[PDB]
Amino acid sequence: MKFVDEASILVVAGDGGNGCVSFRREKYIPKGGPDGGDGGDGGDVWMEADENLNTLIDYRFEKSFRAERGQNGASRDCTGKRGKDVTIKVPVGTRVIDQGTGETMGDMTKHGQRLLVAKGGWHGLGNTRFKSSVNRTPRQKTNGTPGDKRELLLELMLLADVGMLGMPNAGKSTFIRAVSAAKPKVADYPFTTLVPSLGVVRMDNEKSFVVADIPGLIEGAAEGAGLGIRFLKHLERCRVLLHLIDIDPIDGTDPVENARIIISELEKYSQDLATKPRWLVFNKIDLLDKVEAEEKAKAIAEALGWEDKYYLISAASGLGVKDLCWDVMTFIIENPVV
Amino acid sequence: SRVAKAPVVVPAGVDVKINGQVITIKGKNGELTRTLNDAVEVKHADNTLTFGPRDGYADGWAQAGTARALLNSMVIGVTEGFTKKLQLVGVGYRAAVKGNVINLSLGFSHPVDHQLPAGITAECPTQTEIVLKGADKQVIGQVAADLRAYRRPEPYKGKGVRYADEVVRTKEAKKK
Amino acid sequence: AKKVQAYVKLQVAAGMANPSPPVGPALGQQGVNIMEFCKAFNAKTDSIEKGLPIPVVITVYADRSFTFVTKTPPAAVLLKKAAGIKSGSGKPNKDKVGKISRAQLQEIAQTKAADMTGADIEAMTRSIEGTARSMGLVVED
Amino acid sequence: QGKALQDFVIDKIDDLKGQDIIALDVQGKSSITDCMIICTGTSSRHVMSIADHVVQESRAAGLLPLGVEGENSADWIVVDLGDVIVHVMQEESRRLYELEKL
RNA sequence: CAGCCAGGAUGUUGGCUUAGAAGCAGCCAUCAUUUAAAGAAAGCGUAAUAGCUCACUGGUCGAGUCGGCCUGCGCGGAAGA
């Protein structure tokens, strides 16, 4: 229902504590043992996953995260305290990119598992750790090593198994207004969609059908009324993808003859994501003849070159939506990762 | 200061009785009295009411100008009264008035009964509206505030009890 | 031009066929039909010429149909099909982008049926050029 | 109130797809309960959800449940109706425990 | 001076190296036709039509009012066993 923002974070790993140089000559004897032992290991920045959050708005406001430095050594061999581990809570479905080696180090897929993105420092050593008889005056110290200086670029993808790509306001948001709980703003005025939204369908226990809807765009890398292309990166991870084309629009572009462009638009990103399999479904049939649409759907599907099993569903009134309800499960449960 | 320089006009049939620093404003629609701050001089002229400061007081005109403001508000209460409108917005929010008690079902685990003062009454034109009626602005303002404090309007959907003139801005936090 | 109820006007052209990408169904949703764009709107525009955009008010109170009257088309399009270049600025004010003539836009600006402010001819002569020579043109009036 | 409650249990347990229902009589072997009902749920959420139904129906039947065990783990969930104890739990763990021999 | 009742318009969705930008971080001249005045422009801000306010002007009660400098004495800054 609300906006989405993605940004990059600057995180610094805490450097280890510094060794202390001091001596133990308390009251009467000037010549006594040294004081000052270990320092303190620097803090470790962890990557905490929360299913309670979905956005990264809280990252541009505070961009620098400072892990606490290891406490320095003190007298009477009082070793320093280890730096506390600051944990950054991130919505599930984030990628990590490092400046320089700009690759993906980890994928946020399972909630409640922690990742280490900044190795802490190492504590220093005081004079007590270095006390000797060769020097006869132990006063040397070792500084703490600097922490792992890594900069993270965060890319977000929402947790959804079924995607939604199609023509502007062609029924993508109307399909969400089905038995799915989520109900975005849906009508027949222009595009009407400014927020990616996902809903669920409850069929039986321990059966998930999370489906997400994202804003679509027309004529490839072009925008109609202010909507950018950044809504696409929420896609391109879902395990199953479906596609719909509006039929007989009042003022829209001609039939699927134009949708041949859409394939190029999907190929436009980098590689069409290795040509992921597509499923075609129709929408807005109740305004035409069902008996006539049967020949229409068969002819229009063979027109583009798609010789697979398509779906003819009028989701505006929720008619014939059940056939798509069960066949998607057979694709999901029977085809796990291998 | 100069506000007190302009006398306040009182209608016909209302009697003003002054016994020093206490003023009596008996009227058609109320029975109330209020006392001054000992720093204001009041005179009973023709059908107006003038005010002035007192010698030896540093505040002087500042307190005198307040006398016109409060006493003017007392004129409307004893003649037509002051009306305040409260509306309840949201599902499951029901309001009703039983005698001198308003029963509020504000989504709590128990119902809320508010004891209004002697000279304040409420009516229920509909189930989601409370019409506060009174003759003194001070008492009617607080009882509306006391009623508003139970279910202070949250700033995201406007849900709660709100004033008629008051508008509550809605903002989005944790954008998705 | 009376009061509230949201007078609106959206257009890209009147010669073409109500495009979806640029404006779409935003030409009326609170009592304005989308199929009536070629029923009564195309009653006097289709008989003269189809080459210019046209604003129009809606002015519907509670009726199913509309009861508005068309008016003049904008003068911001006369500089493209009747005065010169189509694309336009480029670099708006790094040089002398365009060219105009005093005799230009004299009879073209007088083809308006009835939308004036004052009946003086001299006063309205330089009213249109206010829209002009803001494009990066040169005036030789 | 002997025979009535299990019939009040068997009818409600079958309404939400309670498969492989067995009516047992542990009178004499155990001195803690009168009888127990054993049943299988298809999924963990199925066991968790059906646990709410029996508690809500029991609370609408006047009697107050004496205890529940389902907490962040749906493999084994049980509720109490006083004399009668029902065992809504997963098939996979049912083979590990005893059946019809307690 | 500040209050209160109004206008707050016409080219004008100003076109545009504008993906849209109708007043808004890009773009420009910054003019100009009717009036008592009202800005291609002040903002809260929608996905754009937007919803409303303000700048300037009219009327109303009527005599002080507007915002800058220097200086004495005053407040916060000023929490420990």
mmCIF file of N, CA, C and O in Angstrom, chain A residues 45-124:
data_model
loop_
_atom_site.group_PDB
_atom_site.id
_atom_site.type_symbol
_atom_site.label_atom_id
_atom_site.label_comp_id
_atom_site.label_asym_id
_atom_site.label_seq_id
_atom_site.Cartn_x
_atom_site.Cartn_y
_atom_site.Cartn_z
ATOM 1 N N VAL A 45 29.723 -7.171 13.163
ATOM 2 C CA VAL A 45 28.442 -6.748 12.610
ATOM 3 C C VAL A 45 27.770 -7.951 11.962
ATOM 4 O O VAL A 45 28.343 -8.593 11.076
ATOM 5 N N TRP A 46 26.554 -8.256 12.402
ATOM 6 C CA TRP A 46 25.813 -9.409 11.922
ATOM 7 C C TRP A 46 24.667 -8.969 11.023
ATOM 8 O O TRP A 46 24.245 -7.809 11.044
ATOM 9 N N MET A 47 24.169 -9.912 10.230
ATOM 10 C CA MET A 47 23.062 -9.681 9.308
ATOM 11 C C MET A 47 21.862 -10.467 9.827
ATOM 12 O O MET A 47 21.781 -11.686 9.647
ATOM 13 N N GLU A 48 20.937 -9.769 10.476
ATOM 14 C CA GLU A 48 19.744 -10.392 11.030
ATOM 15 C C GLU A 48 18.581 -10.256 10.058
ATOM 16 O O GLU A 48 18.366 -9.191 9.472
ATOM 17 N N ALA A 49 17.835 -11.342 9.892
ATOM 18 C CA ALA A 49 16.696 -11.384 8.988
ATOM 19 C C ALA A 49 15.401 -11.313 9.783
ATOM 20 O O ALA A 49 15.215 -12.051 10.755
ATOM 21 N N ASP A 50 14.509 -10.418 9.365
ATOM 22 C CA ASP A 50 13.196 -10.272 9.978
ATOM 23 C C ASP A 50 12.129 -10.432 8.910
ATOM 24 O O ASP A 50 12.209 -9.805 7.849
ATOM 25 N N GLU A 51 11.136 -11.270 9.191
ATOM 26 C CA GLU A 51 9.942 -11.364 8.367
ATOM 27 C C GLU A 51 8.930 -10.279 8.709
ATOM 28 O O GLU A 51 7.877 -10.199 8.069
ATOM 29 N N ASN A 52 9.232 -9.450 9.706
ATOM 30 C CA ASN A 52 8.354 -8.384 10.167
ATOM 31 C C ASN A 52 8.537 -7.094 9.376
ATOM 32 O O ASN A 52 7.661 -6.224 9.420
ATOM 33 N N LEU A 53 9.605 -6.986 8.592
ATOM 34 C CA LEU A 53 9.903 -5.786 7.827
ATOM 35 C C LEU A 53 9.983 -6.137 6.350
ATOM 36 O O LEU A 53 10.299 -7.269 5.975
ATOM 37 N N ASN A 54 9.690 -5.148 5.510
ATOM 38 C CA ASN A 54 9.651 -5.327 4.064
ATOM 39 C C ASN A 54 10.443 -4.279 3.301
ATOM 40 O O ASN A 54 10.744 -4.485 2.124
ATOM 41 N N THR A 55 10.787 -3.157 3.931
ATOM 42 C CA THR A 55 11.442 -2.070 3.214
ATOM 43 C C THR A 55 12.789 -1.700 3.820
ATOM 44 O O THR A 55 13.161 -2.198 4.887
ATOM 45 N N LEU A 56 13.514 -0.811 3.144
ATOM 46 C CA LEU A 56 14.828 -0.372 3.594
ATOM 47 C C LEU A 56 14.846 1.140 3.784
ATOM 48 O O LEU A 56 15.844 1.798 3.475
ATOM 49 N N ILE A 57 13.743 1.697 4.289
ATOM 50 C CA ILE A 57 13.665 3.142 4.476
ATOM 51 C C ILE A 57 14.611 3.600 5.579
ATOM 52 O O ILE A 57 15.113 4.730 5.545
ATOM 53 N N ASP A 58 14.874 2.744 6.565
ATOM 54 C CA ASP A 58 15.690 3.097 7.718
ATOM 55 C C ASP A 58 17.185 3.012 7.442
ATOM 56 O O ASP A 58 17.972 2.975 8.394
ATOM 57 N N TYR A 59 17.603 2.968 6.183
ATOM 58 C CA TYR A 59 19.017 2.841 5.854
ATOM 59 C C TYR A 59 19.614 4.090 5.231
ATOM 60 O O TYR A 59 20.812 4.331 5.400
ATOM 61 N N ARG A 60 18.820 4.893 4.518
ATOM 62 C CA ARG A 60 19.326 6.167 4.021
ATOM 63 C C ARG A 60 19.390 7.216 5.126
ATOM 64 O O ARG A 60 20.231 8.121 5.070
ATOM 65 N N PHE A 61 18.518 7.116 6.134
ATOM 66 C CA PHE A 61 18.526 8.090 7.220
ATOM 67 C C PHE A 61 19.759 7.935 8.102
ATOM 68 O O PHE A 61 20.422 8.928 8.424
ATOM 69 N N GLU A 62 20.082 6.708 8.502
ATOM 70 C CA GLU A 62 21.350 6.396 9.156
ATOM 71 C C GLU A 62 22.110 5.424 8.261
ATOM 72 O O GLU A 62 21.711 4.266 8.106
ATOM 73 N N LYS A 63 23.199 5.908 7.666
ATOM 74 C CA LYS A 63 23.951 5.170 6.661
ATOM 75 C C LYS A 63 25.236 4.558 7.197
ATOM 76 O O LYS A 63 25.667 3.513 6.696
ATOM 77 N N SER A 64 25.850 5.166 8.207
ATOM 78 C CA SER A 64 27.098 4.679 8.781
ATOM 79 C C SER A 64 26.796 3.955 10.086
ATOM 80 O O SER A 64 26.224 4.544 11.009
ATOM 81 N N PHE A 65 27.177 2.683 10.156
ATOM 82 C CA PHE A 65 27.038 1.876 11.361
ATOM 83 C C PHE A 65 28.424 1.651 11.949
ATOM 84 O O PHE A 65 29.288 1.056 11.296
ATOM 85 N N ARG A 66 28.628 2.118 13.175
ATOM 86 C CA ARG A 66 29.928 2.076 13.837
ATOM 87 C C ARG A 66 29.899 0.961 14.878
ATOM 88 O O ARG A 66 29.244 1.086 15.917
ATOM 89 N N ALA A 67 30.607 -0.128 14.596
ATOM 90 C CA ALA A 67 30.790 -1.172 15.593
ATOM 91 C C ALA A 67 31.659 -0.652 16.731
ATOM 92 O O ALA A 67 32.636 0.068 16.506
ATOM 93 N N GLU A 68 31.293 -1.011 17.959
ATOM 94 C CA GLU A 68 31.984 -0.483 19.127
ATOM 95 C C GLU A 68 33.424 -0.981 19.167
ATOM 96 O O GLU A 68 33.688 -2.173 18.982
ATOM 97 N N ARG A 69 34.354 -0.061 19.409
ATOM 98 C CA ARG A 69 35.760 -0.421 19.510
ATOM 99 C C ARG A 69 36.011 -1.239 20.770
ATOM 100 O O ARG A 69 35.362 -1.038 21.801
ATOM 101 N N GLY A 70 36.953 -2.173 20.678
ATOM 102 C CA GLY A 70 37.370 -2.943 21.833
ATOM 103 C C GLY A 70 37.940 -2.068 22.930
ATOM 104 O O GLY A 70 38.723 -1.155 22.655
ATOM 105 N N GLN A 71 37.550 -2.331 24.175
ATOM 106 C CA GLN A 71 38.014 -1.513 25.287
ATOM 107 C C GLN A 71 39.518 -1.657 25.472
ATOM 108 O O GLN A 71 40.074 -2.749 25.330
ATOM 109 N N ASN A 72 40.173 -0.544 25.783
ATOM 110 C CA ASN A 72 41.616 -0.543 25.966
ATOM 111 C C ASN A 72 41.995 -1.218 27.279
ATOM 112 O O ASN A 72 41.166 -1.400 28.174
ATOM 113 N N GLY A 73 43.265 -1.598 27.382
ATOM 114 C CA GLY A 73 43.762 -2.168 28.615
ATOM 115 C C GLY A 73 43.821 -1.150 29.736
ATOM 116 O O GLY A 73 43.891 0.060 29.524
ATOM 117 N N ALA A 74 43.791 -1.663 30.964
ATOM 118 C CA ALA A 74 43.815 -0.824 32.153
ATOM 119 C C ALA A 74 44.868 -1.351 33.116
ATOM 120 O O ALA A 74 45.491 -2.391 32.884
ATOM 121 N N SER A 75 45.064 -0.617 34.207
ATOM 122 C CA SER A 75 46.037 -1.012 35.211
ATOM 123 C C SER A 75 45.547 -2.234 35.983
ATOM 124 O O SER A 75 44.391 -2.652 35.873
ATOM 125 N N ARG A 76 46.456 -2.809 36.772
ATOM 126 C CA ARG A 76 46.210 -4.035 37.529
ATOM 127 C C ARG A 76 45.785 -5.187 36.623
ATOM 128 O O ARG A 76 44.998 -6.045 37.029
ATOM 129 N N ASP A 77 46.311 -5.208 35.397
ATOM 130 C CA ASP A 77 46.043 -6.266 34.421
ATOM 131 C C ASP A 77 44.540 -6.429 34.187
ATOM 132 O O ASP A 77 44.014 -7.540 34.104
ATOM 133 N N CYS A 78 43.834 -5.306 34.093
ATOM 134 C CA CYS A 78 42.405 -5.314 33.798
ATOM 135 C C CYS A 78 42.226 -5.323 32.285
ATOM 136 O O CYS A 78 42.302 -4.274 31.636
ATOM 137 N N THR A 79 41.995 -6.507 31.725
ATOM 138 C CA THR A 79 41.815 -6.634 30.287
ATOM 139 C C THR A 79 40.507 -5.986 29.850
ATOM 140 O O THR A 79 39.511 -5.990 30.577
ATOM 141 N N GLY A 80 40.519 -5.427 28.642
ATOM 142 C CA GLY A 80 39.368 -4.709 28.144
ATOM 143 C C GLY A 80 38.200 -5.614 27.804
ATOM 144 O O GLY A 80 38.319 -6.835 27.709
ATOM 145 N N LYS A 81 37.044 -4.985 27.617
ATOM 146 C CA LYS A 81 35.818 -5.691 27.278
ATOM 147 C C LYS A 81 35.669 -5.796 25.767
ATOM 148 O O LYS A 81 35.977 -4.855 25.031
ATOM 149 N N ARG A 82 35.196 -6.953 25.311
ATOM 150 C CA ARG A 82 34.989 -7.187 23.890
ATOM 151 C C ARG A 82 33.857 -6.310 23.374
ATOM 152 O O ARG A 82 32.821 -6.167 24.031
ATOM 153 N N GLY A 83 34.061 -5.716 22.200
ATOM 154 C CA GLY A 83 33.056 -4.869 21.588
ATOM 155 C C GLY A 83 31.753 -5.592 21.314
ATOM 156 O O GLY A 83 31.756 -6.702 20.775
ATOM 157 N N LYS A 84 30.635 -4.976 21.686
ATOM 158 C CA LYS A 84 29.335 -5.598 21.486
ATOM 159 C C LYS A 84 29.013 -5.711 20.000
ATOM 160 O O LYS A 84 29.390 -4.861 19.190
ATOM 161 N N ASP A 85 28.304 -6.781 19.648
ATOM 162 C CA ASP A 85 27.953 -7.066 18.261
ATOM 163 C C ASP A 85 26.686 -6.302 17.898
ATOM 164 O O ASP A 85 25.601 -6.610 18.400
ATOM 165 N N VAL A 86 26.821 -5.311 17.025
ATOM 166 C CA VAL A 86 25.666 -4.584 16.513
ATOM 167 C C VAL A 86 25.062 -5.373 15.358
ATOM 168 O O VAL A 86 25.768 -5.780 14.428
ATOM 169 N N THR A 87 23.754 -5.602 15.421
ATOM 170 C CA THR A 87 23.049 -6.420 14.443
ATOM 171 C C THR A 87 22.126 -5.530 13.625
ATOM 172 O O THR A 87 21.292 -4.810 14.187
ATOM 173 N N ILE A 88 22.271 -5.585 12.306
ATOM 174 C CA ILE A 88 21.422 -4.840 11.386
ATOM 175 C C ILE A 88 20.292 -5.760 10.948
ATOM 176 O O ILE A 88 20.536 -6.819 10.358
ATOM 177 N N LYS A 89 19.057 -5.364 11.239
ATOM 178 C CA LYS A 89 17.887 -6.150 10.873
ATOM 179 C C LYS A 89 17.467 -5.778 9.458
ATOM 180 O O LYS A 89 17.231 -4.602 9.163
ATOM 181 N N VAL A 90 17.376 -6.778 8.586
ATOM 182 C CA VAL A 90 17.079 -6.540 7.176
ATOM 183 C C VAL A 90 15.869 -7.376 6.776
ATOM 184 O O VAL A 90 15.751 -8.535 7.203
ATOM 185 N N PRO A 91 14.948 -6.836 5.981
ATOM 186 C CA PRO A 91 13.854 -7.660 5.457
ATOM 187 C C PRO A 91 14.379 -8.833 4.646
ATOM 188 O O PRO A 91 15.402 -8.741 3.962
ATOM 189 N N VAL A 92 13.662 -9.953 4.737
ATOM 190 C CA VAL A 92 14.059 -11.162 4.027
ATOM 191 C C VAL A 92 13.951 -10.926 2.527
ATOM 192 O O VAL A 92 12.950 -10.389 2.036
ATOM 193 N N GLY A 93 14.988 -11.323 1.791
ATOM 194 C CA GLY A 93 14.997 -11.152 0.353
ATOM 195 C C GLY A 93 15.949 -10.080 -0.132
ATOM 196 O O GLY A 93 15.643 -9.353 -1.081
ATOM 197 N N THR A 94 17.108 -9.969 0.511
ATOM 198 C CA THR A 94 18.091 -8.943 0.194
ATOM 199 C C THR A 94 19.354 -9.584 -0.367
ATOM 200 O O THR A 94 19.705 -10.710 0.004
ATOM 201 N N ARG A 95 20.013 -8.877 -1.275
ATOM 202 C CA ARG A 95 21.316 -9.281 -1.776
ATOM 203 C C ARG A 95 22.397 -8.348 -1.241
ATOM 204 O O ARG A 95 22.142 -7.191 -0.899
ATOM 205 N N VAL A 96 23.617 -8.870 -1.171
ATOM 206 C CA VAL A 96 24.764 -8.133 -0.655
ATOM 207 C C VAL A 96 25.787 -7.989 -1.773
ATOM 208 O O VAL A 96 26.166 -8.978 -2.412
ATOM 209 N N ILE A 97 26.215 -6.754 -2.021
ATOM 210 C CA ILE A 97 27.211 -6.441 -3.039
ATOM 211 C C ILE A 97 28.296 -5.594 -2.388
ATOM 212 O O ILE A 97 27.992 -4.614 -1.698
ATOM 213 N N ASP A 98 29.552 -5.970 -2.606
ATOM 214 C CA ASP A 98 30.692 -5.269 -2.033
ATOM 215 C C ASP A 98 31.356 -4.408 -3.098
ATOM 216 O O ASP A 98 31.561 -4.860 -4.229
ATOM 217 N N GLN A 99 31.683 -3.169 -2.735
ATOM 218 C CA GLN A 99 32.431 -2.303 -3.636
ATOM 219 C C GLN A 99 33.775 -2.938 -3.968
ATOM 220 O O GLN A 99 34.463 -3.469 -3.092
ATOM 221 N N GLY A 100 34.148 -2.883 -5.243
ATOM 222 C CA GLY A 100 35.296 -3.639 -5.701
ATOM 223 C C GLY A 100 34.868 -4.986 -6.246
ATOM 224 O O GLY A 100 34.473 -5.095 -7.410
ATOM 225 N N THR A 101 34.944 -6.022 -5.410
ATOM 226 C CA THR A 101 34.453 -7.343 -5.782
ATOM 227 C C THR A 101 32.924 -7.369 -5.802
ATOM 228 O O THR A 101 32.275 -8.010 -4.969
ATOM 229 N N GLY A 102 32.342 -6.692 -6.790
ATOM 230 C CA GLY A 102 30.905 -6.523 -6.861
ATOM 231 C C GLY A 102 30.145 -7.763 -7.277
ATOM 232 O O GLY A 102 29.562 -7.808 -8.365
ATOM 233 N N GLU A 103 30.143 -8.779 -6.415
ATOM 234 C CA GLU A 103 29.359 -9.984 -6.659
ATOM 235 C C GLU A 103 28.380 -10.208 -5.516
ATOM 236 O O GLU A 103 28.333 -9.416 -4.569
ATOM 237 N N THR A 104 27.596 -11.278 -5.589
ATOM 238 C CA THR A 104 26.617 -11.600 -4.559
ATOM 239 C C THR A 104 27.209 -12.627 -3.604
ATOM 240 O O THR A 104 27.509 -13.756 -4.005
ATOM 241 N N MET A 105 27.377 -12.230 -2.344
ATOM 242 C CA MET A 105 27.980 -13.103 -1.345
ATOM 243 C C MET A 105 26.955 -13.994 -0.658
ATOM 244 O O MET A 105 27.278 -15.133 -0.303
ATOM 245 N N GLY A 106 25.727 -13.514 -0.479
ATOM 246 C CA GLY A 106 24.694 -14.314 0.145
ATOM 247 C C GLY A 106 23.291 -13.902 -0.249
ATOM 248 O O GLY A 106 23.029 -12.721 -0.499
ATOM 249 N N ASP A 107 22.379 -14.867 -0.305
ATOM 250 C CA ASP A 107 20.988 -14.619 -0.660
ATOM 251 C C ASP A 107 20.116 -14.790 0.575
ATOM 252 O O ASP A 107 20.230 -15.792 1.289
ATOM 253 N N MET A 108 19.249 -13.812 0.824
ATOM 254 C CA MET A 108 18.376 -13.825 1.994
ATOM 255 C C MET A 108 17.100 -14.565 1.611
ATOM 256 O O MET A 108 16.195 -13.991 1.002
ATOM 257 N N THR A 109 17.025 -15.836 1.959
ATOM 258 C CA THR A 109 15.862 -16.633 1.580
ATOM 259 C C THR A 109 15.115 -17.207 2.773
ATOM 260 O O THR A 109 13.883 -17.255 2.750
ATOM 261 N N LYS A 110 15.823 -17.634 3.813
ATOM 262 C CA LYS A 110 15.211 -18.241 4.988
ATOM 263 C C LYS A 110 15.262 -17.250 6.143
ATOM 264 O O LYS A 110 16.327 -16.699 6.447
ATOM 265 N N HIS A 111 14.114 -17.023 6.775
ATOM 266 C CA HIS A 111 14.044 -16.099 7.898
ATOM 267 C C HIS A 111 14.694 -16.701 9.138
ATOM 268 O O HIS A 111 14.656 -17.915 9.354
ATOM 269 N N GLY A 112 15.294 -15.839 9.954
ATOM 270 C CA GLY A 112 15.823 -16.251 11.237
ATOM 271 C C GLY A 112 17.229 -16.802 11.229
ATOM 272 O O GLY A 112 17.670 -17.339 12.252
ATOM 273 N N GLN A 113 17.952 -16.690 10.120
ATOM 274 C CA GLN A 113 19.338 -17.129 10.050
ATOM 275 C C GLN A 113 20.245 -15.919 9.874
ATOM 276 O O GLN A 113 19.899 -14.965 9.169
ATOM 277 N N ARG A 114 21.403 -15.962 10.526
ATOM 278 C CA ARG A 114 22.280 -14.810 10.661
ATOM 279 C C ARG A 114 23.485 -14.947 9.740
ATOM 280 O O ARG A 114 23.985 -16.053 9.514
ATOM 281 N N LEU A 115 23.943 -13.815 9.214
ATOM 282 C CA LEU A 115 25.108 -13.758 8.346
ATOM 283 C C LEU A 115 26.116 -12.774 8.926
ATOM 284 O O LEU A 115 25.744 -11.755 9.515
ATOM 285 N N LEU A 116 27.398 -13.088 8.761
ATOM 286 C CA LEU A 116 28.491 -12.266 9.268
ATOM 287 C C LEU A 116 29.095 -11.503 8.095
ATOM 288 O O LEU A 116 29.643 -12.111 7.169
ATOM 289 N N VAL A 117 28.997 -10.175 8.136
ATOM 290 C CA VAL A 117 29.444 -9.324 7.041
ATOM 291 C C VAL A 117 30.635 -8.462 7.416
ATOM 292 O O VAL A 117 31.161 -7.746 6.551
ATOM 293 N N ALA A 118 31.085 -8.500 8.670
ATOM 294 C CA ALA A 118 32.198 -7.653 9.099
ATOM 295 C C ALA A 118 32.935 -8.374 10.224
ATOM 296 O O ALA A 118 32.459 -8.401 11.363
ATOM 297 N N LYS A 119 34.088 -8.950 9.898
ATOM 298 C CA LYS A 119 34.895 -9.628 10.901
ATOM 299 C C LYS A 119 35.504 -8.618 11.866
ATOM 300 O O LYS A 119 36.059 -7.596 11.453
ATOM 301 N N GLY A 120 35.407 -8.914 13.157
ATOM 302 C CA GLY A 120 35.925 -8.018 14.167
ATOM 303 C C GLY A 120 37.439 -8.038 14.244
ATOM 304 O O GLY A 120 38.125 -8.859 13.634
ATOM 305 N N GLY A 121 37.970 -7.101 15.022
ATOM 306 C CA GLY A 121 39.398 -6.975 15.203
ATOM 307 C C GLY A 121 39.937 -7.956 16.227
ATOM 308 O O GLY A 121 39.234 -8.827 16.742
ATOM 309 N N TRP A 122 41.225 -7.801 16.521
ATOM 310 C CA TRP A 122 41.925 -8.648 17.477
ATOM 311 C C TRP A 122 42.494 -7.777 18.585
ATOM 312 O O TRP A 122 43.073 -6.720 18.313
ATOM 313 N N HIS A 123 42.324 -8.220 19.826
ATOM 314 C CA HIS A 123 42.768 -7.446 20.975
ATOM 315 C C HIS A 123 44.288 -7.324 21.002
ATOM 316 O O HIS A 123 45.016 -8.217 20.560
ATOM 317 N N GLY A 124 44.762 -6.196 21.528
ATOM 318 C CA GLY A 124 46.180 -5.964 21.675
ATOM 319 C C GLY A 124 46.748 -6.636 22.910
ATOM 320 O O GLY A 124 46.054 -7.306 23.674
#
